[PDB]
Amino acid sequence: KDYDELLKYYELYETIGTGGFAKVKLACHVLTGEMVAIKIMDKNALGSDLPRVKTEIDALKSLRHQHICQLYHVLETKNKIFMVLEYCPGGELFDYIISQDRLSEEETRVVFRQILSAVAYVHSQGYAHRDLKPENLLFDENHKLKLIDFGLCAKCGSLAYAAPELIQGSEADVWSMGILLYVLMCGFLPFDDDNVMALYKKIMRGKYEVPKWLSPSSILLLQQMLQVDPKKRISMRNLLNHPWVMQDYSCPVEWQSKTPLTHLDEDCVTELSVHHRSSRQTMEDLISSWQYDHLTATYLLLLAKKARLEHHH
Ligand SMILES: Nc1ncnc2c1ncn2[C@@H]1O[C@H](COP(=O)(O)OP(=O)(O)NP(=O)(O)O)[C@@H](O)[C@H]1O
CATH class of the missing domain: 1.10.510.10 (Transferase(Phosphotransferase) domain 1)
Structure with missing residues (x-):
């Protein structure tokens, strides 16, 4: 239902946490195989508190940083808002x-x-x-x-x-x-x-x-x-x-982002372009619109995967 559109892109695992607004589920982004955490919120239940969510969402869309839990995808249905996030298992x-x-x-x-x-x-x-x-x-x-x-x-x-x-x-x-x-x-x-x-x-x-x-x-x-x-x-x-x-540090705190999206990863774009049936040029144009739709999420997850692999290579 609200979940059918979501299940196009993710297969849901167990609930891993809850809070005052959200139920948080482990999930797996199907295309890339990457695990994520999904915040599930009910609009009707949130009611007058809903601005908090749109607040969090707009904040996170403009934040990208090693020590900020990354937002990959935002999905709204009739009764639910889904926020797909970097999975932190620790x-x-x-x-x-x-x-x-x-x-x-x-x-x-x-x-x-x-x-x-x-x-x-x-x-x-x-x-x-x-x-x-x-x-x-x-x-x-x-x-x-x-x-x-x-x-x-x-x-x-x-x-x-x-x-x-x-x-x-x-x-x-x-x-x-x-x-x-x-x-x-x-x-x-x-x-x-x-x-x-x-x-x-x-x-x-x-x-x-x-x-x-x-x-x-x-x-x-x-x-x-x-x-x-x-x-x-x-x-x-x-x-x-x-x-x-x-103390015991020759480095001041590097608060600056180490992960800015300066420019598009060729491999990631390539991988996307195949599945999307579009040229790389086209895919580049699309990704640059940064809608936090399925394309955005796929691109960023492919990127995260690649980084993880490059760390062991
Ligand atoms: N990215 C994540 N990876 C792993 N666990 C997570 C993640 N995000 C949330 N959780 C778990 O889910 C819990 C609730 O998340 P949270 O974002 O605080 O819910 P919330 O209702 O939207 N805000 P709040 O009511 O103030 O706690 C956290 O305390 C964690 O246990």
């Missing part, structure tokens, strides 16, 4: 933290630099994420982080990660990254309560426990990021070459 950063209880400062730095790369890129494109937290960061096959859930992108979110100025746009993401840092290094939240009023007061207050295993450097960074006054809160740029961030 699960959430959340579950990883719980598995390790807490991360070492060193592995925290490795993770944090990737988060920072993604968020700095997102800002470079004029957005703020507004829902940064370990649940919205997924591990891919190579244990690399991929940011998801862009429905709150603005050109808001879980309270424990929400900045003070926002519960009464760049500075906010910085705050949330501070909370995330704390969580990675500590295994728990700095501001936590079952009572929302209590939690709120704790946040506006800005006082948190500082455990013995933490380095002075990281303690400082935290206090720079968890400044209740956004005016006093550290800026993205200064986060990008902050000494804690740069």
Whole structure:
């Protein structure tokens, strides 16, 4: 039905996750054999919340980056919206933290630099994420982080990660990254309560426990990021070459995209052109329209496949 058009292009596997808006299914793009994750949303059930989806969709169409979960295909039927995404099988950063209880400062730095790369890129494109937290960061096959859930992108979110100025746009993401840092290094939240009023007061207050295993450097960074006054809160740029961030690193954080679509891959175009019964020139013209239809998705998945193969060649 709504699924019949989808099943032209994908064969559906099991549900692998859910959220407040979407049921997420593993699937396989038939033409290329590539696995993907499909967000399924019901328009009728979403109702007045639907703009969030069109928000996420328009955001993701203009974001392309190593640490951003890629959007391949958008499909609307009478009752459903389907978003076909890069499959990340490593699960959430959340579950990883719980598995390790807490991360070492060193592995925290490795993770944090990737988060920072993604968020700095997102800002470079004029957005703020507004829902940064370990649940919205997924591990891919190579244990690399991929940011998801862009429905709150603005050109808001879980309270424990929400900045003070926002519960009464760049500075906010910085705050949330501070909370995330704390969580990675500590295994728990700095501001936590079952009572929302209590939690709120704790946040506006800005006082948190500082455990013995933490380095002075990281303690400082935290206090720079968890400044209740956004005016006093550290800026993205200064986060990008902050000494804690740069510790044991001769490289500043490369937030710039490593995956821009500069120009069309010949092999991929060729492969598409055969299946499409059109010349390569024609296919080039078509692909450049970037409609996020089946053509777009096939092209990008062929590209991802090729990259994966080139990594083992
Ligand atoms: N690309 C993906 N690869 C693997 N698992 C995914 C992927 N996208 C989502 N998931 C899983 O599905 C869950 C729900 O995704 P999510 O995008 O947060 O749903 P949502 O309803 O649209 N947003 P939210 O209600 O705020 O969580 C995630 O927490 C993951 O467990």
